[PDB]
Design a binder for this molecule. Structure first.
Ligand SMILES: CC(=O)N[C@@H]1[C@@H](O)[C@H](O[C@@H]2O[C@H](CO)[C@@H](O)[C@H](O)[C@H]2NC(C)=O)[C@@H](CO)O[C@H]1O
Length: 342
């Protein structure tokens, strides 16, 4: 029963690792170590060494059984560019593999995660396969030589097994992934946002082709063992500015990104509601939204999270993950999620 949370190092001054309620998790990720092109000596951002070192001892104080992983990469054009350069170069792949394993041990992490959005087109999937295969072997080798349990290995995946469902450029090799990785983190969010001029449920469980369930279905149909899938749930919402203040439902016309640049933390959504926004639960999509004047935000709330976590349990998944834990300062949704699975 995997209860996973991502902590982004950017949030340190407002949400240090000590603020994480680690009682509500089995695994916590430090996001992110950098690829460090062109040498690919993987490292935490220079100047954050102390934060990275203290992360695991700090979170374990509240729940000593909690384990940690360090995630490499993250969303971003530069990260994608760097994985693409890395994966085509056998020597660079060797440097990456050696340095990433050494990094996890250096800072006391129990595993590694690759956050690569995304290994497409086909050539990029093929070269990512080379990187991951070599990493899996090196992880097993380090376990033998050190005598310690092998590092865990996970990766972020698109919500769907096919990249992309509308135009198939490539797809995740599920048998390969099941063999080399402990699990994958299914990014079942950002289905809708301010890039569309109409409001929608950004992480709809069901509805449309862009839903968490359809994505999960696609991985299972391909032959992914259910226990290898960990369902992502966002701790942020996607916001729009409304074209008309009297049109406030799902599918309402919009004119651009709401605060803050199209994304709002769950905690800020709670502030929004306490400041007069109306919360609506949408049963059709299994989601929530809130609005006030010209601002509209779609997100997951207490009810939709419980429904998603039960869904994951029903689908026999390995568990769930939250992106990202700093966005729910009072850990409202991680509490509901943990209680639901138990
Ligand atoms: C289901 C799907 O393919 N959704 C796409 C969105 O992912 C994407 O939005 C972007 O998602 C990133 C991570 O998923 C975010 O980091 C990023 O902020 C977000 N971009 C914006 C402008 O909000 C959109 C836009 O490219 O396309 C969807 O198809």
């Amino acid at each position: 029963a995997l209860k996973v949370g991502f902590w982004p190092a950017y949030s340190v001054s407002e949400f240090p690792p000590s603020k994480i309620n680690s009682r509500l998790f089995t695994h916590l990720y430090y996001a992110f170590a950098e690829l460090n092109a062109p040498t690919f000596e993987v490292r935490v951002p220079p100047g954050s060494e102390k934060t990275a070192e203290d992360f695991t001892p700090t979170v374990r104080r509240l729940n000593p059984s909690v384990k940690t992983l360090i995630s490499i990469g993250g969303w971003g054009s530069e990260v994608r560019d760097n994985f693409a350069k890395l994966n085509s170069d056998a020597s660079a792949r060797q440097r990456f593999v050696k340095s990433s394993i050494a990094l996890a041990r250096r800072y006391g992490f129990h595993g590694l995660d690759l956050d690569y959005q995304y290994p497409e087109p086909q050539l990029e999937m093929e070269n990512f396969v080379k990187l991951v295969s070599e990493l899996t072997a090196a992880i097993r080798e380090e376990a033998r030589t050190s005598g310690k349990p092998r590092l865990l290995l996970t990766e972020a995946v698109y919500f769907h097994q096919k990249l992309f469902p509308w135009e198939v450029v490539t797809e995740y090799p599920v048998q390969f992934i099941a063999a080399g990785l402990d699990w994958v983190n299914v990014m079942a969010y950002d289905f809708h946002g301010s890039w569309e001029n109409f409001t929608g449920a950004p992480a709809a469980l069901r509805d449309s082709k862009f839903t968490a369930s359809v994505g999960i279905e696609s991985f299972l149909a391909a032959g992914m063992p259910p226990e290898k899938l960990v369902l992502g749930i966002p701790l942020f919402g996607r916001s729009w500015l409304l074209k008309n203040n009297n049109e406030v439902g799902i599918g309402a016309p919009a004119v651009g990104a709401g605060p803050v640049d199209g994304a709002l933390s769950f905690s800020e959504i709670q502030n929004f509601i306490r400041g007069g926004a109306r919360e609506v639960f949408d049963t059709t999509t299994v989601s929530a939204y809130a609005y006030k004047d010209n601002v509209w935000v779609g997100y997951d709330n207490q009810q939709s999270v419980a429904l998603k976590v039960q869904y994951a349990k029903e689908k026999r998944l390995g568990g769930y993950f939250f992106w990202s834990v700093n966005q729910d300062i009072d850990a409202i949704l991680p509490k509901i999620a943990s209680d639901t699975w138990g």
